[PDB]
Design a protein around this nucleic acid. Structure first.
Ligand SMILES: [Cl-]
Ligand SMILES: [Cl-]
Ligand SMILES: [Cl-]
Ligand SMILES: [Cl-]
Ligand SMILES: [Mn+2]
Ligand SMILES: [Mn+2]
Ligand SMILES: [Mn+2]
Ligand SMILES: [Mn+2]
Ligand SMILES: [Mn+2]
Ligand SMILES: [Mn+2]
Ligand SMILES: [Mn+2]
Ligand SMILES: [Mn+2]
Ligand SMILES: [Mn+2]
Ligand SMILES: [Mn+2]
Ligand SMILES: [Mn+2]
Ligand SMILES: [Mn+2]
Lengths: 84, 94, 108, 99, 97, 78, 91, 104
DNA sequence: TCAATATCCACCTGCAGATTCTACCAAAAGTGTATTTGGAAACTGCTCCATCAAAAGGCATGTTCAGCTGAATTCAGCTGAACATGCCTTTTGATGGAGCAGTTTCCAAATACACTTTTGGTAGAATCTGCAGGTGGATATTGAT
DNA sequence: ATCAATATCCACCTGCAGATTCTACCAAAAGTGTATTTGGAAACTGCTCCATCAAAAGGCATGTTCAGCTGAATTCAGCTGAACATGCCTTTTGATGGAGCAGTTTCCAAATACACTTTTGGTAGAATCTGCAGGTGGATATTGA
């Protein structure tokens, strides 16, 4: 299996623009895209860290949707729809 | 193998009561189950806390009721308290 | 033995009183659980799901669909002040957002 | 002419469209890779249930979308219409996130 | 006579108050305000003195915090004067509005 | 009574918050926020009072109210 | 009567600062602190055990809880301190 | 011969055990859980006291008061993060004036 | 730069309210003694998580090109800051009670246990039907004149 | 105001996924009878929480002046929005291993359960002492000149 690098750039300019649109943003500065990637990175890392912590506590090698749900819930970011 | 419990069945009955004509996609039922589980935990949690703050070892409908008042906003609380009280007095009336 | 009557019917409810009672005992909420606690809890739960299904169903109708989907649940929640507060820190997968554009952004 | 919409017209057209729909706006495979890369840096040999990756995407997109609304409010507050990094920072600061 | 320029005394107070910890709201007026609001939830209530103090502490720490976010919002709009739109913006982002 | 919370007191609070210049409309605005805050906390507290079947609001009632409103206070019993 | 962590906080105070004392108001702050952290850790351990369908909270649950609640460095040392107390106790 | 002394702690192990049992957290509690939990509670306590002690010493005072606990916490990245949604009564705020507000 | 106003910064000073400190008792906390039982091993059954193949076409990447937006610059009308000036509450104490949180102790009512009976609810299957995805024209909206 | 370009609606279709409904079984929820508290009685008892003055200072409420801050208006150098050409790589669809999650079944090492048996943490009055709050006195910092 190949090495994983620079995947944060997979979060393209077009995709960030779409998200801002849904968020009601009309005009976007050129520097928004890198800040966004940075912000998303931190968000993901924190949720993945807690999620993976639940996985390991359960002696599993597979991250389950529940792991993510509990990770989100404890970060005050409760998610409906994968609870089962 | 093994069975997984859920409120789907009940959510579905209530749905038919308010919207006879209407159905619901499984994704939407999935969200309804998360909602029921969430509020249940929020209420039991606050109830458990209430009982513990008052050195009481049992959670009675009285705890569930204060929890509801502390959890739900305005009208929602009032209506829920009404249905809650109604079910209990009806339940106890044999 | 005697005519088996569910606590739900005895309570005049659709939601499962027995199930809810069990969940309380096995949730480590308290040493003991009163008989009226699950009855009152099942009723509040049933009332709340009736309230959001009522509104979701209307949202569905407005979009000319007969089947409630997540987006209809979002509209019902976000458009009702109280439910919105109650679920103010909850995210509904596949629900999107409410159409809302700040005035200053519209063509002069 | 050739016909040409004025700047801002298509942007508003896009806002109405995306606020109307609920599908995910980030591409799937790329997002999946980002998750596996980040996970891998925390712990090796990890595998994911497909719904776990979808739960993460649903969460990140709701989060970014909500952050852009606050960001948009911060820009408007500065008598602007263009969101800038400084706006996103003001929002996360007031939100109590990184502060 | 002798006058300090606008803002000079303002900065002086910021330094004094950011350095002290005493409650900045007159005690009596506060207690008076608390009982009035409480009276609407249940009549003839008695209040533990420590209960009133906890409220004033929470309340003052809350306003001070809110004033910091408000100041930031005003600085953002390139102003130095806080205004209702500033308190309003901050409460919205915080999810209070 | 809300008027009891005076301009000069609001000024001090703002000062501890690092505010240098204050618009005249801030005072009434601040009072409204102050009132909403106290109403929310006190309501939750008195609800803990009434549940404990007491007639006296205790610091713990307040501390518990604060905790559930996301405003945890240290120094009064928790 | 009413029990607090006061006595213990004070003992610990003397170890880090023999020469330093502590006002009662500040002692109140420390009690609130100990109580709060206790609830947070106990609460998370409670959930961890429930998610994993267990009826008992072991040092293993308290450890994951600490790992999920404390920021980076604080977590490490806390974890160090904890396993250190448990090993020494087991002997 | 107490468990705290056996664990080599100054924090009440027996009490942490009793509190865990009576708090409705789980049906049963391991023997090491209260030991661990108590060690963790002690360590954070020493950490705060250490810094608040330094805060007092820097104020040329020998008795730690609330102000000192506030300066120790807010000036520490991690403790600040941990107690981010907590307010220390009578602790005030960190001296801090936005640059733009400075004169001339 | 100079002269002076009002602001800090200091090393001392000394009660005083708030701290260490004293000297006894119950409600834990630590001990032996069974009594239980939760939940690591040990296996397997059998989901469902990686990987791969192959084929498009949706959608990302780069460029042009110039509309109009973010940012300087100005400028002056007011809004807030700084300041005496009085004067009205907030503050600070000591009652003096009266309201009331806390026990005591008591049992009738309300759980928790135990041990079978009696079905409502959960897989899968079989059966049923909204509506996603396409199309082709009615409006509808924009932007050049 | 007028076109014409281009972007929406708005029904009208119909087979699929996906819902619904149909069946077969247990895992639970229901009965019953038997111990076990739970915690809501009514009677009292020391806090400690108001209501009462007092008397002051403080600290707040009022104008006065005018410094300098916030908009309003104007200008313009690009930045960032459309539109278009290219063709990359995410999507879609199966087809397979097996990696590894769940089930079922053992039992011990590790918790409850329980009466005792000390012990420690609390509480109510002894002896102190860390600083708050004041003080002349000495540079500062801020301003008008
Ligand atoms: Cl009950
Ligand atoms: Cl910026
Ligand atoms: Cl305003
Ligand atoms: Cl353990
Ligand atoms: Mn209806
Ligand atoms: Mn077993
Ligand atoms: Mn140009
Ligand atoms: Mn502009
Ligand atoms: Mn002027
Ligand atoms: Mn009485
Ligand atoms: Mn049946
Ligand atoms: Mn369609
Ligand atoms: Mn290309
Ligand atoms: Mn295998
Ligand atoms: Mn002792
Ligand atoms: Mn001093």
């Amino acid at each position: 299996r190949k090495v994983l690098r620079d995947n944060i750039q997979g979060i393209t300019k077009p995709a960030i623009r779409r998200l801002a649109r849904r968020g009601g943003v009309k005009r976007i500065s050129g520097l928004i895209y890198e800040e966004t990637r940075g912000v998303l990175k931190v968000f993901l890392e924190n949720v993945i860290r807690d999620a993976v912590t639940y996985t390991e506590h359960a002696k599993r090698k597979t991250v389950t949707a529940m792991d993510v749900v509990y990770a989100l819930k404890r970060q005050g970011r409760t998610l409906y729809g994968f609870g089962g | 193998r093994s069975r997984k419990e859920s409120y789907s069945i009940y959510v579905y009955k209530v749905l038919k009561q308010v919207h006879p004509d209407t159905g619901i996609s499984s994704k939407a039922m999935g969200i309804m189950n998360s909602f029921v589980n969430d509020i249940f935990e929020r209420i039991a949690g606050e109830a458990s806390r209430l009982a513990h703050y008052n050195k009481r070892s049992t959670i009675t409908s009285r705890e569930i009721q204060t929890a509801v008042r502390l959890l739900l906003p305005g009208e929602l609380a009032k209506h829920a308290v009404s249905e809650g009280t109604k079910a209990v007095t009806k339940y106890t009336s044999a | 033995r005697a005519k088996a009557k569910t606590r739900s019917s005895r309570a005049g409810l659709q939601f499962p009183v027995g199930r809810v009672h069990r969940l309380l005992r096995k949730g480590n909420y308290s040493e003991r659980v009163g008989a009226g606690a699950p009855v009152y809890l099942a009723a509040v739960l049933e009332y709340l799901t009736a309230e959001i299904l009522e509104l979701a169903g209307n949202a569905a109708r407005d979009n000319k669909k007969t089947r409630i989907i997540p987006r209809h649940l979002q509209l019902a929640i976000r458009n009702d002040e109280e439910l919105n507060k109650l679920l103010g820190r909850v995210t509904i997968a596949q629900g999107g957002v409410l159409p809302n554009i700040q005035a200053v952004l519209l063509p002069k | 002419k050739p016909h040409r919409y004025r700047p801002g017209t298509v942007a508003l057209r896009e806002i109405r469209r995306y606020q109307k729909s609920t599908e995910l706006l980030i591409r799937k495979l790329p997002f999946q890779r980002l998750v596996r890369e980040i996970a891998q840096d925390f712990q090796t040999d990890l595998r994911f249930q497909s719904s776990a990756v979808m739960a993460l995407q649903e969460a990140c997109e709701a989060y970014l979308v909500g952050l852009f609304e606050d960001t948009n409010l911060c820009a408007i507050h500065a008598k602007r219409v263009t969101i800038m990094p400084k706006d996103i920072q003001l929002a996360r600061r007031i939100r109590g996130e990184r502060a």
